[PDB]
Write a protein that binds this ligand. Structure first.
Ligand code: NAG
Ligand code: NAG
Ligand code: NAG
Ligand code: NAG
Ligand code: NAG
Ligand code: NAG
Ligand code: NAG
Lengths: 299, 239, 49, 50
């Protein structure tokens, strides 16, 4: 911060070697995930008995949802939706059911209510997405359709991620029921859906997608195309969602047939295995350092 | 026709498995997980009883001529809950989470399944692979955590009769996303036909513990320290 | 010995979370939108400072 | 309407058997732990709205 400099040596900035290109190395899978099959099933189970499906070992495309329907509610919590198309996951859990239109607000972590406490409960650390779209046209009857039921009573609360199917008479009085008349009710009540019903009471189809990370090597990701492999150059690399920048070289490490990564004392990644061709690659950071300027006086 | 005799014995230093899939070389690592404590008290069965599952199970056997074949897991194990079923035969291994109507005294006819269960039921998951059971000591660790059934195995040559005094690390064998609750388990035996036979195995239970593991130049675990056994081990783990 | 110990502690301090979802900035940036990433980045900044 | 409650034993199961409340929100205290706390006095304000 001066226009004149005295004689000496000064440390000014830092230098770093820039990357040249980008490398993407995904495993070769062409199988498509049954997202379409899970949808448009022409029959969804009730809220008190919600359908659960496991999705793994396929290529996940989320444009099918985009062309599916104009969803009334589409909320993602742990991940931004727009970035869903380039992530890798271990496995996916899809839970499908049908509820009332106005009950969609109750489907969220840290939420209370009739449905949120008696039919479905989400964990506090939920990582996934929730989709809710209207189904008045397909799940309504002129006389009234009662195929869908919801639970109204329970002895205690519900933990996240469990399903209750036991059917019994709920007790409200002190004396044991052994009957129906005196202060004893039925927790399950049938939904009443009619076309003349307005918005907020027509049936709405709800699908909850649950992901997880920090697990076995990822399986559900194939929406992006792979590239070639280069060595001895500063490059950006992406192996099954593990991203970084550096130089990849041949490695002489005796990996046992079940490891994938490799760490050191400081606990940072230094070796990797190529998914498509089983081979050990050493990773080294690109060159960086300080810059000093040597000058006599400006006089 | 079946006689089961119980005894108690020492576990020494056995039942150590690889915690994760990360390669490490020439390093000492502190880990916290469900382990079998050193010099613990294991049960010796000699030849079925139904045993608890708790949090995890360590199983060891040394029988010959393939007397022992598979295990069954569950919580009620009769008609109301899907139950695991691992079956090992000459060519392959079956794994079924199907709902079985188990017999009062399940066993293998050797080869109809009517001796185990009357019929299957509404079930989805199934798996098949190369047989697990490949003078020889076979060690297994089973544990069920957060929607995952994990099995580690190890095969060793033995010349003695009791637990060998040595160290062996159990490499991972299989991981399955089953997602059920397990509380009891039982062993499955095969009887030629009703001829009387004999077998022997050892059972232990896992507990949460902190260990110090040693990785050599090649990424193999060669020694470990149990940090809560005695003051010297605590000092070793501190340093 | 003291110099090596201090340097090792400083390097090892980089794998802590300081009450965030992850200790890696790359995945935080690759799985979150800008309005929600800074709420996690600032905690790492404070801890490392 | 405002009422003051003091010098008594407070049981919250009567509310549970009362009715299936549409809204039940507690701010400074978790509802489940209301059954083992001690308070100086309670103020109950009752009315009817839309
Ligand atoms: C689902 O099924 C309906 C009717 O069977 C069909 O019109 C539609 O194309 C299918 N696929 C999707 C993505 O909706
Ligand atoms: C759940 O979805 C699967 C997928 O086709 C279907 O076979 C099954 O009948 C569904 N169950 C219920 C209760 O809707
Ligand atoms: C997939 O990649 C592996 C790794 O190089 C290769 O051995 C295999 O032949 C490939 N298969 C297909 C169908 O591309
Ligand atoms: C194991 O338990 C038995 C009784 O269950 C007891 O007598 C014995 O001392 C314990 N320890 C060993 C090493 O057997
Ligand atoms: C062994 O099991 C495999 C797979 O279940 C089966 O194909 C084969 O027939 C079995 N062999 C015998 C002798 O039972
Ligand atoms: C299996 O479970 C389904 C779903 O509850 C049920 O409809 C069926 O009757 C059960 N039994 C069989 C043999 O499928
Ligand atoms: C590691 O492997 C090499 C090559 O087989 C071997 O010479 C060396 O003894 C091994 N390390 C140990 C501790 O045995």
């Amino acid at each position: 911060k001066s226009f004149t400099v005295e004689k000496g040596i000064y440390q000014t900035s830092n230098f770093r070697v820039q990357p040249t290109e980008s490398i993407v190395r995904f495993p070769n899978v062409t199988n498509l995930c049954p997202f379409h099959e899970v949808f448009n099933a022409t029959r969804f189970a009730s809220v008190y008995a919600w359908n659960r499906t496991r999705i793994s070992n396929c290529v996940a495309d989320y444009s099918v949802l985009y062309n599916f329907a104009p969803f009334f509610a589409f909320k993602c919590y742990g991940v931004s939706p727009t970035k869903l198309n380039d992530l890798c996951f271990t496995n996916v859990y899809a839970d499908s059911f049908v509820i009332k239109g106005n009950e969609v607000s109750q489907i969220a972590p840290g939420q209370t209510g009739n449905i949120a406490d008696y039919n479905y409960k989400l964990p506090d650390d939920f990582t996934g997405c929730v989709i809710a779209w209207n189904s008045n046209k397909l799940d309504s009857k002129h006389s009234g359709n009662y195929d869908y039921w919801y639970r109204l009573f329970r002895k205690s609360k519900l933990k996240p991620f469990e399903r209750d199917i036991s059917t019994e008479i709920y007790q409200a009085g002190n004396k044991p029921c052994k009957g129906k008349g005196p202060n004893c009710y039925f927790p399950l009540q049938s939904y009443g859906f009619r076309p003349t019903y307005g918005v907020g009471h027509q049936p709405y189809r709800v699908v909850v997608l649950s992901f997880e990370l920090l697990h076995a090597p990822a399986t559900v990701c194939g929406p992006k195309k792979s590239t070639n492999l280069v060595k001895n150059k500063c490059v950006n690399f992406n192996f099954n969602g593990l991203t970084g920048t550096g130089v990849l070289t041949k490695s002489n490490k005796k990996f046992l047939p079940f490891q994938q990564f490799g760490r050191d004392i400081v606990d940072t990644t230094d070796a990797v295995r190529d998914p498509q061709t089983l081979e050990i690659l050493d990773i080294t950071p690109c060159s960086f350092g300080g810059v000093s300027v040597i000058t006599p006086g400006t006089n | 026709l079946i006689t089961t005799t119980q005894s108690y014995t020492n576990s020494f230093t056995r039942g150590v498995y690889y915690p994760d899939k990360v390669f490490r070389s020439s390093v000492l690592h502190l880990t916290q997980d469900l382990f079998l404590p050193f010099f613990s008290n294991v049960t010796w069965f000699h030849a079925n009883p139904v045993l608890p599952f708790n949090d995890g199970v360590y199983f060891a056997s040394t029988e010959k001529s393939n007397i022992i074949r598979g295990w069954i897991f569950g919580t009620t194990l009769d008609s109301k809950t899907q139950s695991l079923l691992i079956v090992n035969n000459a060519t392959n291994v079956f794994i079924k989470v199907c709902e079985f109507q188990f017999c009062n005294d399940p066993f293998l006819d050797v080869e109809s399944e009517s001796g185990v269960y009357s019929s299957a039921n509404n079930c989805t998951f199934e798996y098949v692979s190369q047989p697990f059971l490949m003078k020889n000591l076979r060690e297994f660790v089973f544990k069920n955590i957060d929607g995952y059934f994990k099995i580690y195995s190890k095969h060793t040559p033995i010349i003695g009769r009791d637990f060998p005094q040595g160290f062996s690390a159990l490499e991972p064998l299989v991981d399955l996303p089953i997602g059920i609750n397990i509380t009891r388990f039982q062993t499955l035996l095969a009887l030629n036909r009703w001829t009387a036979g004999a077998a022997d195995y050892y059972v232990g239970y896992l507990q949460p513990r902190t260990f110090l593991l040693k990785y050599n130049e090649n990424g193999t675990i060669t020694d470990a320290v149990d940090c809560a056994l005695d003051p010297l081990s605590e000092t070793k783990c501190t340093l | 010995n003291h110099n090596a110990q201090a340097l090792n502690t400083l390097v090892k301090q980089l794998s802590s979370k300081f009450g965030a979802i992850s200790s890696v900035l790359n995945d935080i940036l690759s799985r979150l939108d800008p309005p929600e990433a800074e709420v996690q980045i600032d905690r790492l900044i404070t801890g490392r400072l």
